[PDB]
Structure 1
Amino acid sequence: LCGMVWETDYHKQPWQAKISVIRPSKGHESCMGAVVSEYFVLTAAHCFSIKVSVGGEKRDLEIEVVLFHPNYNINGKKEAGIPEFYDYDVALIKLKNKLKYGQTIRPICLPCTEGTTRALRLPPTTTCQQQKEELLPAQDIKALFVSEEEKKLTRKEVYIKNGDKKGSCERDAQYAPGYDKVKDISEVVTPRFLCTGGVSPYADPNTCRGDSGGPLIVHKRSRFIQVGVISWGVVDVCQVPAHARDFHINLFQVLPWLKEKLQDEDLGFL
């Protein structure tokens, strides 16, 4: 029973995971993640000694393995003079021990699962396509992501540009660090990416580096479905141009991988 809260930072966002990598050159790097099953946290590949915690605990959970998307390659396009390439920027952290679900630790819904079909009160014949059409229609989609302000968790409302504004949102990748000399923007914005940020239709807050890996969520029918993983932004805000966009891995585009790694988690992938 995923994507559900009850009547308190990690009470209100119980799927949220905080990640620290303490790298032997004395600078701690931060990321976020979402609990997706009792053994797994979903996050970004580019976040990677490693400290993971859930439920706002001081405790750091014991990590078994970290699984990376086979097509992820930050260096994939250096030859073409593209410094960092974020295609397939997703990773699963497998925990050694079963998480105990509580009021501070609950899993979020993933796309193309029974959990999501139930959460959206859809019929048993609901297909993966129909879910995508409900959750990601061709328009501006109200969504949120979860951030850290002053060591507490805060929701921030954003709009995915997936209709008439999509192109405008993607083109703005030209202003990101290192992409200013890219001829074809689709070399860096692949069909794996959703796009938020900018001022139309509303003035969306932007992600910080430390928000990377955290879920991009749709709040629908009183449930929380994860639609994307925060990957990269155009400007580090933490004067904000109207071309400050954020890009997220669309989870509907990495399902072969998700299904395979999570095949034993009773998520009921379609």
Structure 2
Amino acid sequence: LSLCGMVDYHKQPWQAKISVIGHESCMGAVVSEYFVLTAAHCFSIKVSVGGEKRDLEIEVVLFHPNYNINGKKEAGIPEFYDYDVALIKLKNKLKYGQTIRPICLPCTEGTTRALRLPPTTTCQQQKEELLPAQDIKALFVSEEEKKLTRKEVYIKNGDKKGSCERDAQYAPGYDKVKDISEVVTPRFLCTGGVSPYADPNTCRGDSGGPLIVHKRSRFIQVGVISWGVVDVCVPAHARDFHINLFQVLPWLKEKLQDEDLGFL
């Protein structure tokens, strides 16, 4: 079992850069020797790790079976980001080192050990530790002038969760949605806004990158960056929505079953 979430690419050795050819940009995270986790909506395909120039040979890209960006077009919702996760399977085994390391995923033995929790630890116990009912200090990784940079955000998972979710009404094409639960599903975590702190916002190029909790000197991926309310790249309603990886575990467990991650 790899030591996951342990340390520019020196400081974010899990980070992957994705280009799709006028170039669309996304990010992802190394989660095993053969897999990069990213957003489904990011999808000729160029993936790089370790700040390398080299583009890695792709075997297949696997998509969450419930993902359908067009799924609510008939209801007048232009883009529906539910289950916005994909796994890039690499042809060649990644060589872990100073520049290339896997991030921890929820409800794995890797995360149990990173959090110094006992062997009886459940998936629910990991969720209570990482995503308590409060404002949760987190980070994401962006690019500025070809250098990777950390940005600190707060996940609104307590008394501010409703306020964060309701700001979805300001996103492009969502202004006529009666029931915000139609676009903000139970798959989403919410960051951004000015309470409790003035959170920075994701850029479109940051989509697919990990939303990370930094705990006990370790980095645990809790989310995949999915969509924003405002393209800032700032109103108090500028929120960002992330796929909660605790909510896509059956799919992660099935696709990564042979990756020696020790899913619970």
Q: TM-score range by the shorter chain?
A: over 0.9
- C-alpha displacement of 1:261: 0.1
- C-alpha displacement of 1:121: 0.1
Give 3-state SS (helix, strand or coil) of 2:84's partner: coil
- The Cα offsets for residues 25-53 of structure 1, whole Å up to 9 and x where unpaired, read as xx100000000000000000000000000
- C-alpha displacement of 1:187: 0.1
- The Cα offsets for residues 227-247 of structure 1, whole Å up to 9 and x where unpaired, read as 000000000001x00000000
- C-alpha displacement of 1:67: 0.1
- C-alpha displacement of 1:188: 0.1
- The Cα offsets for residues 91-122 of structure 1, whole Å up to 9 and x where unpaired, read as 00000000000000000000000000000000
Alignment of 1:47-86 (within 5 A): 47-86=42-81
- C-alpha displacement of 1:252: 0.1
Equivalence for 1:3: 5
Give 3-state SS (helix, strand or coil) of 2:211's partner: strand
Equivalence for 2:83: 88
Give 3-state SS (helix, strand or coil) of 1:75's partner: coil
- C-alpha displacement of 1:148: 0.5
Aligned equivalents of 1:157 and 1:163: distance in 2?
A: 18
Aligned equivalents of 1:34 and 1:169: distance in 2?
A: 25
Q: Which runs of 4+ in 1 moved over 2 A?
A: none
Structure 2's unaligned 5+ residue stretches are none
- C-alpha displacement of 1:145: 0.2
- The Cα offsets for residues 176-223 of structure 1, whole Å up to 9 and x where unpaired, read as 001000000000000000000000000000000000000000000000
Aligned equivalents of 1:234 and 1:151: distance in 2?
A: 25
Give 3-state SS (helix, strand or coil) of 2:254's partner: helix
Equivalence for 2:242: 248
Aligned equivalents of 1:38 and 1:165: distance in 2?
A: 38
Aligned equivalents of 1:56 and 1:167: distance in 2?
A: 38
Q: What is the TM-score of this pair, normalised by structure 2?
A: 0.99
Aligned equivalents of 2:146 and 2:169: distance in 1?
A: 33
Aligned equivalents of 1:126 and 1:10: distance in 2?
A: 31
Aligned equivalents of 1:11 and 1:116: distance in 2?
A: 21
Identity of aligned residues (%): 100
Aligned equivalents of 1:136 and 1:158: distance in 2?
A: 14
- C-alpha displacement of 1:156: 0.2
Aligned equivalents of 2:65 and 2:199: distance in 1?
A: 32
Equivalence for 2:150: 155
- C-alpha displacement of 1:146: 0.2
Give 3-state SS (helix, strand or coil) of 2:48's partner: strand
Structure 1's unaligned 5+ residue stretches are none
Equivalence for 2:111: 116
- C-alpha displacement of 1:15: 0.1
- C-alpha displacement of 1:163: 0.0
- C-alpha displacement of 1:162: 0.1
- C-alpha displacement of 1:175: 0.2
Aligned-residue RMSD, C-alpha: 0.2
Aligned equivalents of 2:145 and 2:196: distance in 1?
A: 28
